[PDB]
Amino acid sequence: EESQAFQRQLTALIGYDVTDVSNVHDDELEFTRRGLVTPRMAEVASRDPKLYAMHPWVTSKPLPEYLWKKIANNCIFIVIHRSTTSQTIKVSPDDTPGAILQSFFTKQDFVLRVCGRDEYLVGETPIKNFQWVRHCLKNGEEIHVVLDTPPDPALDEVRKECDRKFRVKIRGIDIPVLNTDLTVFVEANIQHGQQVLCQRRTSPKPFTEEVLWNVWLEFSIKIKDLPKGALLNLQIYCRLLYYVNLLLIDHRFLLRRGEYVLHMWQISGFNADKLTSATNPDKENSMSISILLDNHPIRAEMPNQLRKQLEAIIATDPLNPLTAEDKELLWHFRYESLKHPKAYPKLFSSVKWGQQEIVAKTYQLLARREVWDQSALDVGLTMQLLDCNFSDENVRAIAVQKLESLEDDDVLHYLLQLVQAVKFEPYHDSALARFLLKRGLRNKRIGHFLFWFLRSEIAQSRHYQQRFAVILEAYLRGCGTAMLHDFTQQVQVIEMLQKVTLDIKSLSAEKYDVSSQVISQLKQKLENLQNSLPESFRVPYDPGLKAGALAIEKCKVMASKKKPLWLEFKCADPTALSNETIGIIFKHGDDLRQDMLILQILRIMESIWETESLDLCLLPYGCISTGDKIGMIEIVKDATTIAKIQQSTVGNTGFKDEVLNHWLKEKSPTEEKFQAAVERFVYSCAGYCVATFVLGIGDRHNDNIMITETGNLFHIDFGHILGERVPFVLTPDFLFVMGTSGKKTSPHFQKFQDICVKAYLALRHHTNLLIILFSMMLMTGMPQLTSKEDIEYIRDALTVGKNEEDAKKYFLDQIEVCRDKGWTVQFNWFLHLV
Ligand SMILES: Nc1cc(C(F)(F)F)c(-c2nc(N3CCOCC3)nc(N3CCOCC3)n2)cn1
């Protein structure tokens, strides 16, 4: 029975009962639950308990130039606390936590914990190499450290537990309901990495609630020739309305045989949902298609001009399409191509996956894969091999093979996109899934995040939740009883909080109406909850923080188009430094997945900029989508919208240039501090300007841009909340802080535009990585996005194909257009929302 209680607890954590059989036509999921057990226990067993327990967060990257500046002493200062006792040691960047530890007693079961958060500075790592330290240098703060005992690893314990042609028969389609009368027909395709190897169509028939053809669609392709990972894709056109897929080769390497009745997905009035092997859970309202399967298996050197040809091909963007020529060139000279890792995606797209002799040659090629493994890891390339263009398990495994060399810091960087890329795997068990399982179980930070990212999908994607539940379930059985306990506390609060949010939204108006009625109602429910509700819970976007009791006094309902709750919690650490509450917004009615994808690319932009020694002061705040159209947002303290700043000085509606500067100086404690704010505004303004431009989310209304009293500017509410055009927002008030009016420069403005250029060129160095992240995010984070047209934006913006000077020129032009437009575009937004 312990087992039932435990599978039920798991079901509760996960949000889906992986033992559900109601929407399946085979045993792939179970098989996969079984398959993943090995990789779990292998990593549980493998992991160092003390290290798993304390999870030091580290990098092996260089300290950026900009941080060494903060320290030229060659000595850093760390404050060590014990109750009131509090010495203040100074140390060397190359010092180790131990050394410094022993060094401290010069003035053994003790360890240094960051004050107020469950973050531990430990292990054989130079202090400079701890992120928290870096974060502290980055923000000009003292490294406050208490000394306490190491957490007991005992709490991390794990519970002991044919040459025939291929054909298919289309029997008919069936729907319960149906506006006019029109013709309908069925299109069957065989697909491998979104390349259709063959296509057959039935004849049209009148569209009645049941339509039958009972036909054999015999394909040109041979059985022998079907590749593992191939999809039988079935679609109804009447305009395409419905789709479903079925893998032609099963998880055991066997050809599919028998009768299938598949409940289809409908197209709303390209994307990754379109490649799912899953069928629609909705049998009562779904369209179905009935089919029958009755058919288990298993040196000359390149001349000079031609290699010039090859090379040109390789240097093209990932979005460049390849001609029949390019493909032959790539494949006939494959042994040459194998020497250019940068060419592997293009080459593997030139393979005729529908000829078994070729696939066999391809695998051979994979054996002489020497240049590839030697290669310095390239995340652009690796990601490209994990997108919708490759269904081959061996090709994808090599990418995954390069991923193995990522340190945890880097895995945290790409974890969301890596998790999203599992939607591009043909089967539920895959090397990437195993990779992701391994690293979460290896590190608690990655685990924590892997937990929520997988739960995000499970809660809101009928198309991949089954696959993801199995992966999450596997993670849960190796994290340890401590993480389980923690996750349970998180799921309880958020599950709680979402209801409160739901009830209130359910009592509240479409218009901007807040009343004591509503707030009373807000506080009452909070009052109920407040009185058990777990004592403490870990903040999901920031696992170091422990959130304590509500400060119901400070909680309110926000005046936003939905009714987000503004909540403030006491910290649960007595070791913490301040009285400051932890502020979290909680909302239903936005799709946070989309916000989640952007802020992660923004974290990726920052890290790229760090490689080139730049810090553009982005503020990609925490955001998790916890369920369908619901999740949480971090509140950056001391922040207001640019629109409010206008409101409070100018009329409620309509726009003065001088206002933002007034606001900053008035908020500033001192001139020293005011001048720091201006400097921070300049960097962050540029950063948002370049980053936003590249992602094509530049044109924004004022209510959706924010600044802190410290001068840090940041955008909000991506994905998308309100909408002559502008590349980005560089308005007169912004110019004014920087010291300019009209077409006149300033030492600061000069500073702003050179930074923009420095920043933009840094990004174009990773043109390929960004194009692929961007295209991937559209496919897995938007509902649907029109393959070639939408993706293409990022090339024009990355100015693919030009040298640096032209690029530099181009971006300065964009700045001029912003200079040209003033308040024009802002004004029209006000009008659109008036
Ligand atoms: N998808 C979404 C949704 C929202 C929200 F909360 F408005 F619904 C937000 C949001 N996020 C915030 N933040 C987040 C960063 O820290 C400051 C507060 N503020 C707002 N405002 C609503 C109108 O008055 C100004 C404050 N909105 C972000 N992304």
From Swiss-Prot:
Residue ranges of domain PIK helical in the record: 299-478
Record keywords, A-Z: Angiogenesis, ATP-binding, Cell membrane, Chemotaxis, Cytoplasm, Disease variant, Endocytosis, Immunity, Inflammatory response, Kinase, Lipid metabolism, Membrane, Nucleotide-binding, Phosphoprotein, Serine/threonine-protein kinase, Transferase
UniProt key word Acetylation: no
UniProt binding sites for ATP: 583-592, 618-626, 714-722
Residues in PI3K-RBD domain copies: 73-149
Superkingdom of origin: Eukaryota
Expression tissues: Pancreas, skeletal muscle, liver and heart.
GO BP term (any one): regulation of calcium ion transmembrane transport
Regulation: Activated by both the alpha and the beta-gamma G proteins following stimulation of G protein-coupled receptors (GPCRs). Activation by GPCRs is assisted by the regulatory subunits (PIK3R5 or PIK3R6) leading to the translocation from the cytosol to the plasma membrane and to kinase activation. Inhibited by AS-604850 and AS-605240.
Other noteworthy facts: Candidate target in therapy for inflammatory diseases. Selective inhibitors and protein ablation are anti-inflammatory in multiple disease models such as asthma, rheumatoid arthritis, allergy, systemic lupus erythematosus, airway inflammation, lung injury and pancreatitis.
Family: Belongs to the PI3/PI4-kinase family.
Biological function: Phosphoinositide-3-kinase (PI3K) that phosphorylates PtdIns(4,5)P2 (Phosphatidylinositol 4,5-bisphosphate) to generate phosphatidylinositol 3,4,5-trisphosphate (PIP3). PIP3 plays a key role by recruiting PH domain-containing proteins to the membrane, including AKT1 and PDPK1, activating signaling cascades involved in cell growth, survival, proliferation, motility and morphology. Links G-protein coupled receptor activation to PIP3 production. Involved in immune, inflammatory and allergic responses. Modulates leukocyte chemotaxis to inflammatory sites and in response to chemoattractant agents.
Disease annotated for this entry: Immunodeficiency 97 with autoinflammation: An autosomal recessive disorder with variable features. Affected individuals have childhood-onset antibody defects, cytopenias, and T lymphocytic pneumonitis and colitis. Some patients may have features of hemophagocytic lymphohistiocytosis.
Subunit structure: Heterodimer of a catalytic subunit PIK3CG and a PIK3R5 or PIK3R6 regulatory subunit. Interacts with GRK2 through the PIK helical domain. Interaction with GRK2 is required for targeting to agonist-occupied receptor. Interacts with PDE3B; regulates PDE3B activity and thereby cAMP levels in cells. Interacts with TPM2. Interacts with EPHA8; regulates integrin-mediated cell adhesion to substrate. Interacts with HRAS; the interaction is required for membrane recruitment and beta-gamma G protein dimer-dependent activation of the PI3K gamma complex PIK3CG:PIK3R6.
Annotated protein name in UniProt: Phosphatidylinositol 4,5-bisphosphate 3-kinase catalytic subunit gamma isoform
Species per Swiss-Prot/TrEMBL record: Homo sapiens (Human)
Gene name of the record: PIK3CG
